[PDB]
Amino acid sequence: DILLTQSPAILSVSPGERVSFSCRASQSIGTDIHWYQQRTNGSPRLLIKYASESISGIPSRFSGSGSGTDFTLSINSVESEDIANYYCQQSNRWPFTFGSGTKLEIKRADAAPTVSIFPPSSEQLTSGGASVVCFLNNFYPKDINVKWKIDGSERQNGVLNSWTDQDSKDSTYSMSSTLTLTKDEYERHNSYTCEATHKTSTSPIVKSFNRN
């Protein structure tokens, strides 16, 4: 069976640069290679067929080249919407096989996080539960740390964090931090604080509210 090697597994390039993804077949397959794009949470989408043939409705900055064993997918000037996983697939010999995929990442300018904190909803409280939600949005680079304080003292239990993948709209990252407490516990405190530390500033970006 035809093995398709895609290396490197991640490409990082600066906005507007040209980028080239590599696909290597374990034996010669003429031009029977096709390329797909898959964004986060989306299904694959055909970009190039038969190594170099353009597909209707695909931006003209996408092109493909090569024949035999070595194939290239190129993007002429990378932009944010190109952030995605890219797969090659051969149809020269049975069975059809797929490459293991290359992730495109874009190295954009630093941006500090936009921080927002949210008190539990009336509706949640009714149910005996309290979740305080903090968004750290549209930052870059991805490294970032978040700290909860309750009445001025650090809180670590009940905190669950979630990070998006790089954003295909602006090449940034975002993160959510969620502190979950019972209604009781939540009411035995006044001040809830979400603190974001990120290389864009030496001091934390801090957001708080008071329960009353």
Partner: protein, 219 residues
């Protein structure tokens, strides 16, 4: 029109079986093949097998253990994949895709998220995320929806029935105590809310529920 329709999700008990469907529309030719492709969370695309509806013949990936059985119904123009004796190894998104006999997958279905677990289906609770009264704002304001306590994956979250996609992102679910939780964030010009409505729509395919939650300023 959407060329290939798959259900959003299927929950299957360990050792049980399920039949995925893929309903096709658009031009259909005797040369059409319907392919199925498996994708494990955070992994690549794996070819499972193919069927030619005009003749009913199916072939399967010989490198992997055969869990699938492909059939098709020409009358309803629908392809089926029967997965049998599932384990947690079988949890994945399964796509169907159409090939015109010329080697490439011109169109793909949206995929069915199959979760193999003994846990029970649970619809999510959807809570608004509106800023507290002391929050200051600039030219933009940020709102949210907290989607909590659901099983299994996935949920789809849109804002204003899809019309609002700029300034939106939805975080990956975190799982705890056999329940998932996530939030979705939306940012609009501050001048525009609350005068213009902002609402999150939360679909949870595995429980057949679709819930709306309007986001209003806190009282």
């Amino acid at each position: 029109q959407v060329q290939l329709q798959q259900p959003g999700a299927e929950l299957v008990k360990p050792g049980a079986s399920v039949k995925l469907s893929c309903k096709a529309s658009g031009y259909t030719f005797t040369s059409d093949w319907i392919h199925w492709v498996k994708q494990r969370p955070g992994h690549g695309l794996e070819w499972i097998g193919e069927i030619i509806p005009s003749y009913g013949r199916a072939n399967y990936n010989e490198k992997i253990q055969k869990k699938a059985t492909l059939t098709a119904d020409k009358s309803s123009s629908t392809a089926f994949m029967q997965l049998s004796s599932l384990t947690s190894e079988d949890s994945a998104v399964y796509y169907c895709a159409r090939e015109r006999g010329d080697g490439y997958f011109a169109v793909w279905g949206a995929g069915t998220t199959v979760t193999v677990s003994s846990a029970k289906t649970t619809p999510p609770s959807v809570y608004p995320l509106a800023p507290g009264s002391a929050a200051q704002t600039n030219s933009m304001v940020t709102l949210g929806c907290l989607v909590k306590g659901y099983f299994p994956e996935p949920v789809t979250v849109t804002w204003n029935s899809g019309s609002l996609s700029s300034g939106v992102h939805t975080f990956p679910a975190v799982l705890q105590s056999d329940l998932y939780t996530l939030s979705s964030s939306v940012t609009v010009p501050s001048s525009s809310w609350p005068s213009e409505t902002v609402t999150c729509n939360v679909a949870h395919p595995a429980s057949s529920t679709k819930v709306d939650k309007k986001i209003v300023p806190r009282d």
